[PDB]
Amino acid sequence: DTVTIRTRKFMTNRLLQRKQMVIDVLHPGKATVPKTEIQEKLAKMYKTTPDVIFVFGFRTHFGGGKTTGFGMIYDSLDYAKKNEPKHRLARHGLYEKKKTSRKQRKERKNRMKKVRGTAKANVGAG
Protein backbone atom coordinates (compact mmCIF):
# COMPACT_ATOMS: atom_id res chain seq x y z
CA ASP A 1 0.00 0.00 0.00
CA THR A 2 0.99 3.70 -0.12
CA VAL A 3 -0.01 4.54 3.52
CA THR A 4 2.83 4.60 6.07
CA ILE A 5 3.35 5.79 9.65
CA ARG A 6 6.51 7.40 10.98
CA THR A 7 6.84 8.67 14.53
CA ARG A 8 8.74 11.69 15.78
CA LYS A 9 9.98 13.17 19.07
CA PHE A 10 8.78 10.21 21.06
CA MET A 11 8.54 10.60 24.82
CA THR A 12 7.57 8.12 27.54
CA ASN A 13 5.60 10.06 30.15
CA ARG A 14 5.45 8.20 33.45
CA LEU A 15 3.95 11.14 35.33
CA LEU A 16 0.70 10.47 33.32
CA GLN A 17 0.96 6.74 32.42
CA ARG A 18 1.29 7.24 28.63
CA LYS A 19 3.75 7.52 25.76
CA GLN A 20 3.23 10.42 23.39
CA MET A 21 4.66 11.16 19.96
CA VAL A 22 4.08 12.88 16.62
CA ILE A 23 2.68 10.97 13.65
CA ASP A 24 3.58 11.35 9.97
CA VAL A 25 1.33 9.71 7.35
CA LEU A 26 2.77 9.38 3.80
CA HIS A 27 -0.46 8.73 1.85
CA PRO A 28 -0.09 10.07 -1.76
CA GLY A 29 -3.01 9.84 -4.26
CA LYS A 30 -5.65 9.16 -1.54
CA ALA A 31 -7.85 11.36 0.66
CA THR A 32 -6.86 11.87 4.33
CA VAL A 33 -6.68 8.59 6.30
CA PRO A 34 -9.55 7.92 8.81
CA LYS A 35 -8.47 8.08 12.50
CA THR A 36 -9.61 4.44 13.10
CA GLU A 37 -7.40 3.21 10.27
CA ILE A 38 -4.43 5.06 11.85
CA GLN A 39 -4.81 3.81 15.42
CA GLU A 40 -4.78 0.10 14.47
CA LYS A 41 -1.44 0.53 12.63
CA LEU A 42 0.01 2.28 15.66
CA ALA A 43 -1.10 -0.77 17.63
CA LYS A 44 0.73 -3.11 15.28
CA MET A 45 3.72 -0.77 15.62
CA TYR A 46 3.74 -0.88 19.42
CA LYS A 47 2.05 -4.28 19.89
CA THR A 48 -0.61 -3.31 22.41
CA THR A 49 -4.22 -2.88 21.25
CA PRO A 50 -6.40 -0.47 19.26
CA ASP A 51 -8.03 0.63 22.52
CA VAL A 52 -5.41 2.44 24.61
CA ILE A 53 -4.51 4.64 21.61
CA PHE A 54 -5.76 8.19 21.00
CA VAL A 55 -4.90 10.45 18.07
CA PHE A 56 -5.83 14.01 17.13
CA GLY A 57 -4.64 17.08 15.19
CA PHE A 58 -3.93 15.72 11.68
CA ARG A 59 -3.62 18.68 9.35
CA THR A 60 -2.76 17.84 5.71
CA HIS A 61 -0.19 19.93 3.80
CA PHE A 62 -0.73 21.86 0.59
CA GLY A 63 -0.21 19.67 -2.51
CA GLY A 64 -1.31 16.33 -0.94
CA GLY A 65 0.90 13.64 0.45
CA LYS A 66 1.84 14.06 4.08
CA THR A 67 -0.08 14.87 7.26
CA THR A 68 1.17 15.35 10.81
CA GLY A 69 -0.71 14.84 14.05
CA PHE A 70 -0.32 14.02 17.74
CA GLY A 71 -0.79 10.61 19.30
CA MET A 72 -0.80 9.07 22.76
CA ILE A 73 -0.75 5.45 23.92
CA TYR A 74 -1.85 4.63 27.48
CA ASP A 75 -0.86 1.66 29.67
CA SER A 76 -4.18 0.54 31.07
CA LEU A 77 -7.62 1.42 29.71
CA ASP A 78 -8.72 3.07 33.00
CA TYR A 79 -5.65 5.39 33.12
CA ALA A 80 -6.87 6.69 29.78
CA LYS A 81 -10.40 6.97 31.32
CA LYS A 82 -8.88 9.11 34.14
CA ASN A 83 -6.22 11.19 32.33
CA GLU A 84 -8.08 11.99 29.06
CA PRO A 85 -10.28 15.03 28.44
CA LYS A 86 -13.95 13.94 28.32
CA HIS A 87 -14.73 14.86 24.70
CA ARG A 88 -11.80 12.73 23.46
CA LEU A 89 -13.31 9.75 25.33
CA ALA A 90 -16.64 10.61 23.63
CA ARG A 91 -15.20 10.42 20.04
CA HIS A 92 -15.07 6.61 20.17
CA GLY A 93 -17.84 6.13 22.70
CA LEU A 94 -16.56 5.77 26.26
CA TYR A 95 -18.55 8.74 27.78
CA GLU A 96 -21.86 10.62 27.00
CA LYS A 97 -23.17 14.25 27.17
CA LYS A 98 -26.35 15.52 28.94
CA LYS A 99 -28.23 18.84 29.44
CA THR A 100 -29.35 20.35 26.21
CA SER A 101 -28.39 24.07 26.40
CA ARG A 102 -26.50 26.71 28.35
CA LYS A 103 -29.68 28.86 28.40
CA GLN A 104 -31.79 26.24 30.21
CA ARG A 105 -29.13 25.68 32.92
CA LYS A 106 -28.75 29.47 33.36
CA GLU A 107 -32.48 30.25 33.58
CA ARG A 108 -33.25 27.38 35.98
CA LYS A 109 -30.57 28.78 38.36
CA ASN A 110 -32.11 32.25 38.15
CA ARG A 111 -35.66 30.96 38.95
CA MET A 112 -34.35 28.87 41.87
CA LYS A 113 -32.58 31.93 43.32
CA LYS A 114 -35.95 33.36 44.39
CA VAL A 115 -37.21 30.59 46.76
CA ARG A 116 -35.97 29.27 50.16
CA GLY A 117 -35.85 25.94 52.03
CA THR A 118 -36.75 23.62 49.14
CA ALA A 119 -36.30 24.68 45.49
CA LYS A 120 -38.74 21.84 44.75
CA ALA A 121 -40.94 22.26 41.63
CA ASN A 122 -38.33 24.37 39.71
CA VAL A 123 -36.37 21.07 39.27
CA GLY A 124 -38.86 18.35 40.40
CA ALA A 125 -41.68 19.68 38.14
CA GLY A 126 -39.37 21.55 35.65
Binding site: M11, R14, L15, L16, N83, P85
Partner: protein, 263 residues
Protein backbone atom coordinates in the same frame (compact mmCIF):
# COMPACT_ATOMS: atom_id res chain seq x y z
CA UNK B 1 -11.41 50.64 39.54
CA UNK B 2 -8.61 49.42 41.83
CA UNK B 3 -9.69 49.27 45.44
CA UNK B 4 -7.87 46.07 46.34
CA UNK B 5 -5.17 43.73 45.14
CA UNK B 6 -5.26 42.52 41.54
CA UNK B 7 -5.24 38.85 40.69
CA UNK B 8 -4.95 38.49 36.90
CA UNK B 9 -1.87 39.00 34.75
CA UNK B 10 -2.06 39.90 31.02
CA UNK B 11 0.08 37.92 28.55
CA UNK B 12 1.95 40.89 27.11
CA UNK B 13 2.71 42.43 30.50
CA UNK B 14 4.11 39.15 31.82
CA UNK B 15 7.87 38.91 32.32
CA UNK B 16 10.00 38.41 29.24
CA UNK B 17 12.27 35.62 30.47
CA UNK B 18 9.21 33.35 30.74
CA UNK B 19 9.45 33.20 26.95
CA UNK B 20 5.71 33.08 26.39
CA UNK B 21 4.09 33.21 22.98
CA UNK B 22 1.67 35.98 21.88
CA UNK B 23 -1.34 34.28 20.22
CA UNK B 24 -2.51 31.57 22.63
CA UNK B 25 -4.80 33.87 24.71
CA UNK B 26 -4.99 37.14 26.67
CA UNK B 27 -3.78 35.97 30.13
CA UNK B 28 -0.67 34.51 31.79
CA UNK B 29 -0.40 32.37 34.91
CA UNK B 30 0.13 35.16 37.47
CA UNK B 31 2.37 33.50 40.07
CA UNK B 32 0.80 33.21 43.48
CA UNK B 33 2.23 34.94 46.51
CA UNK B 34 5.34 33.22 47.76
CA UNK B 35 8.97 33.55 48.77
CA UNK B 36 10.20 34.80 45.39
CA UNK B 37 9.42 38.10 43.73
CA UNK B 38 6.84 38.18 40.96
CA UNK B 39 9.33 39.09 38.23
CA UNK B 40 12.13 36.78 39.46
CA UNK B 41 9.96 33.65 39.93
CA UNK B 42 9.05 30.87 37.54
CA UNK B 43 5.64 29.31 38.27
CA UNK B 44 5.43 25.55 38.40
CA UNK B 45 2.95 25.51 35.53
CA UNK B 46 5.42 27.10 33.13
CA UNK B 47 8.15 24.60 34.04
CA UNK B 48 6.13 21.47 33.15
CA UNK B 49 4.46 22.31 29.85
CA UNK B 50 6.59 25.00 28.25
CA UNK B 51 9.95 23.47 29.18
CA UNK B 52 9.77 19.77 30.02
CA UNK B 53 6.76 19.17 27.74
CA UNK B 54 5.42 16.72 30.33
CA UNK B 55 1.92 18.16 30.15
CA UNK B 56 0.05 19.83 27.32
CA UNK B 57 -2.74 21.99 28.75
CA UNK B 58 -3.35 23.57 32.13
CA UNK B 59 -5.52 20.71 33.31
CA UNK B 60 -2.78 18.17 32.67
CA UNK B 61 -0.50 20.25 34.88
CA UNK B 62 -3.19 20.33 37.56
CA UNK B 63 -3.58 16.52 37.48
CA UNK B 64 0.15 15.97 37.43
CA UNK B 65 0.58 18.12 40.52
CA UNK B 66 -2.37 16.68 42.44
CA UNK B 67 -0.88 13.16 42.51
CA UNK B 68 1.87 14.55 44.82
CA UNK B 69 4.74 13.83 42.42
CA UNK B 70 6.59 17.17 42.44
CA UNK B 71 8.81 18.36 45.27
CA UNK B 72 10.19 21.88 45.68
CA UNK B 73 12.94 21.79 48.32
CA UNK B 74 11.86 18.46 49.77
CA UNK B 75 8.33 19.58 50.50
CA UNK B 76 5.44 18.47 48.29
CA UNK B 77 3.79 21.43 46.59
CA UNK B 78 0.29 21.09 45.17
CA UNK B 79 -0.14 24.64 43.83
CA UNK B 80 0.55 24.81 40.12
CA UNK B 81 1.45 28.52 40.08
CA UNK B 82 3.85 28.24 43.00
CA UNK B 83 6.76 30.68 42.55
CA UNK B 84 9.92 28.62 42.22
CA UNK B 85 13.08 30.74 41.78
CA UNK B 86 16.88 31.02 41.80
CA UNK B 87 18.33 28.31 44.04
CA UNK B 88 15.31 26.00 44.22
CA UNK B 89 15.70 22.27 43.51
CA UNK B 90 12.70 20.57 41.87
CA UNK B 91 12.55 16.76 42.31
CA UNK B 92 10.32 14.38 40.37
CA UNK B 93 10.43 11.11 42.28
CA UNK B 94 8.31 8.98 39.95
CA UNK B 95 10.95 9.56 37.26
CA UNK B 96 14.15 9.81 39.31
CA UNK B 97 15.42 13.16 38.01
CA UNK B 98 16.30 16.48 39.61
CA UNK B 99 16.89 20.07 38.51
CA UNK B 100 18.45 23.34 39.72
CA UNK B 101 17.03 26.74 38.79
CA UNK B 102 20.07 28.79 37.59
CA UNK B 103 20.13 31.59 35.01
CA UNK B 104 21.50 30.64 31.59
CA UNK B 105 23.87 33.30 30.21
CA UNK B 106 21.25 35.00 27.94
CA UNK B 107 19.46 35.97 31.19
CA UNK B 108 16.73 33.31 31.58
CA UNK B 109 16.17 30.04 33.49
CA UNK B 110 17.01 26.78 31.74
CA UNK B 111 16.66 23.11 32.68
CA UNK B 112 19.75 21.89 34.53
CA UNK B 113 19.66 18.26 35.69
CA UNK B 114 21.80 17.51 38.74
CA UNK B 115 23.02 14.38 40.45
CA UNK B 116 20.78 13.14 43.30
CA UNK B 117 23.66 13.23 45.77
CA UNK B 118 23.83 16.99 45.17
CA UNK B 119 20.13 17.87 45.41
CA UNK B 120 20.33 17.77 49.18
CA UNK B 121 21.72 21.25 49.80
CA UNK B 122 21.00 24.68 48.41
CA UNK B 123 22.66 28.04 48.76
CA UNK B 124 21.08 31.17 50.19
CA UNK B 125 22.13 34.80 50.35
CA UNK B 126 21.94 36.63 53.65
CA UNK B 127 19.65 39.68 53.64
CA UNK B 128 19.29 40.75 57.26
CA UNK B 129 20.70 40.25 60.75
CA UNK B 130 18.89 41.01 63.97
CA UNK B 131 18.77 40.09 67.65
CA UNK B 132 15.37 38.80 68.70
CA UNK B 133 13.79 38.71 72.14
CA UNK B 134 15.96 37.48 75.03
CA UNK B 135 19.03 38.09 72.88
CA UNK B 136 18.72 35.41 70.19
CA UNK B 137 20.37 36.27 66.85
CA UNK B 138 18.43 35.57 63.67
CA UNK B 139 18.91 35.42 59.91
CA UNK B 140 16.83 36.12 56.81
CA UNK B 141 17.78 34.67 53.44
CA UNK B 142 16.70 35.71 49.97
CA UNK B 143 13.87 33.15 49.92
CA UNK B 144 12.30 34.34 53.22
CA UNK B 145 13.75 31.59 55.44
CA UNK B 146 14.49 32.48 59.06
CA UNK B 147 17.40 30.73 60.75
CA UNK B 148 17.67 31.01 64.53
CA UNK B 149 21.06 30.93 66.27
CA UNK B 150 23.52 31.37 63.37
CA UNK B 151 27.28 31.54 63.78
CA UNK B 152 28.44 34.99 64.91
CA UNK B 153 30.60 35.69 61.88
CA UNK B 154 28.04 35.36 59.08
CA UNK B 155 27.03 38.83 57.95
CA UNK B 156 25.05 40.50 55.17
CA UNK B 157 25.70 39.67 51.52
CA UNK B 158 27.28 36.37 52.51
CA UNK B 159 26.23 32.98 51.20
CA UNK B 160 25.24 29.95 53.28
CA UNK B 161 24.79 26.30 52.31
CA UNK B 162 21.77 24.82 54.06
CA UNK B 163 20.20 21.36 54.11
CA UNK B 164 16.67 20.70 52.94
CA UNK B 165 15.58 18.45 55.80
CA UNK B 166 16.85 20.57 58.68
CA UNK B 167 17.73 24.06 57.60
CA UNK B 168 20.61 24.50 60.02
CA UNK B 169 23.28 26.09 57.84
CA UNK B 170 26.44 24.08 57.23
CA UNK B 171 29.00 26.24 55.40
CA UNK B 172 29.21 29.90 54.52
CA UNK B 173 31.13 31.95 52.01
CA UNK B 174 32.06 35.48 53.00
CA UNK B 175 31.70 38.38 50.57
CA UNK B 176 35.08 39.92 49.86
CA UNK B 177 37.60 40.49 47.08
CA UNK B 178 38.60 37.33 45.22
CA UNK B 179 35.65 34.93 45.53
CA UNK B 180 33.45 33.70 42.71
CA UNK B 181 30.07 35.30 42.08
CA UNK B 182 27.07 34.96 39.80
CA UNK B 183 25.14 38.10 38.85
CA UNK B 184 21.34 38.11 39.24
CA UNK B 185 20.03 41.45 37.94
CA UNK B 186 19.94 43.95 35.12
CA UNK B 187 22.09 43.79 32.01
CA UNK B 188 24.74 41.37 33.19
CA UNK B 189 22.36 38.51 34.11
CA UNK B 190 23.80 34.99 34.53
CA UNK B 191 27.53 35.95 34.23
CA UNK B 192 30.26 34.54 36.53
CA UNK B 193 33.56 35.96 37.69
CA UNK B 194 35.74 36.97 40.59
CA UNK B 195 34.49 40.00 42.50
CA UNK B 196 37.79 41.91 42.33
CA UNK B 197 36.38 45.21 43.64
CA UNK B 198 33.67 47.01 45.56
CA UNK B 199 33.18 50.76 45.70
CA UNK B 200 30.98 52.37 48.33
CA UNK B 201 28.93 55.53 47.83
CA UNK B 202 27.30 56.08 51.20
CA UNK B 203 23.55 56.20 51.00
CA UNK B 204 23.05 55.07 47.42
CA UNK B 205 23.53 51.76 45.66
CA UNK B 206 27.11 50.69 46.18
CA UNK B 207 28.67 49.37 42.97
CA UNK B 208 30.63 46.16 42.38
CA UNK B 209 33.01 45.00 39.64
CA UNK B 210 33.63 41.48 38.30
CA UNK B 211 36.03 39.79 35.89
CA UNK B 212 35.26 36.79 33.69
CA UNK B 213 37.65 33.97 32.75
CA UNK B 214 38.50 35.94 29.61
CA UNK B 215 39.45 39.35 30.96
CA UNK B 216 35.98 40.78 30.36
CA UNK B 217 34.94 43.00 33.25
CA UNK B 218 31.45 44.27 34.03
CA UNK B 219 30.25 46.35 36.95
CA UNK B 220 26.89 45.84 38.68
CA UNK B 221 25.08 46.84 41.85
CA UNK B 222 25.94 45.12 45.12
CA UNK B 223 22.32 44.08 45.63
CA UNK B 224 22.68 41.95 42.53
CA UNK B 225 25.79 39.94 43.42
CA UNK B 226 25.35 36.36 44.61
CA UNK B 227 28.49 34.59 45.83
CA UNK B 228 28.55 30.92 44.74
CA UNK B 229 32.13 29.91 45.46
CA UNK B 230 35.17 30.37 47.68
CA UNK B 231 37.33 31.32 44.74
CA UNK B 232 37.64 29.98 41.21
CA UNK B 233 35.81 26.87 42.50
CA UNK B 234 32.02 27.01 42.30
CA UNK B 235 30.40 24.89 44.97
CA UNK B 236 27.19 24.05 43.05
CA UNK B 237 27.30 22.52 39.55
CA UNK B 238 27.13 24.90 36.52
CA UNK B 239 25.18 24.95 33.20
CA UNK B 240 27.04 24.43 29.89
CA UNK B 241 29.14 27.44 28.90
CA UNK B 242 29.43 28.63 32.51
CA UNK B 243 28.19 32.25 32.26
CA UNK B 244 30.83 33.36 29.67
CA UNK B 245 28.35 35.56 27.62
CA UNK B 246 30.04 35.29 24.20
CA UNK B 247 29.31 38.09 21.67
CA UNK B 248 27.02 37.55 18.61
CA UNK B 249 30.03 37.50 16.23
CA UNK B 250 31.15 34.37 18.11
CA UNK B 251 27.71 32.83 18.50
CA UNK B 252 27.41 32.91 14.71
CA UNK B 253 30.73 31.14 14.20
CA UNK B 254 29.90 28.33 16.60
CA UNK B 255 26.47 27.93 15.01
CA UNK B 256 28.11 27.65 11.59
CA UNK B 257 30.96 25.31 12.52
CA UNK B 258 28.90 22.93 14.64
CA UNK B 259 26.27 23.20 11.86
CA UNK B 260 23.70 22.40 14.55
CA UNK B 261 20.77 22.23 12.15
CA UNK B 262 19.76 18.66 13.06
CA UNK B 263 20.60 15.61 15.15
Amino acid sequence: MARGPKKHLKRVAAPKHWMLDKLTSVFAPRPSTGPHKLRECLPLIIFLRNKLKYALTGDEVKKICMQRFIKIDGKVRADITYPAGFMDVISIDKTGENFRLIYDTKGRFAVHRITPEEAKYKLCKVRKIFVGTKGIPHLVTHDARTIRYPDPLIKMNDTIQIDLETGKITDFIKFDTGNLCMVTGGANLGRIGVITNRERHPGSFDVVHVKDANGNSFATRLSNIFVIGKGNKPWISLPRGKGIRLTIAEERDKRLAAKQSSG
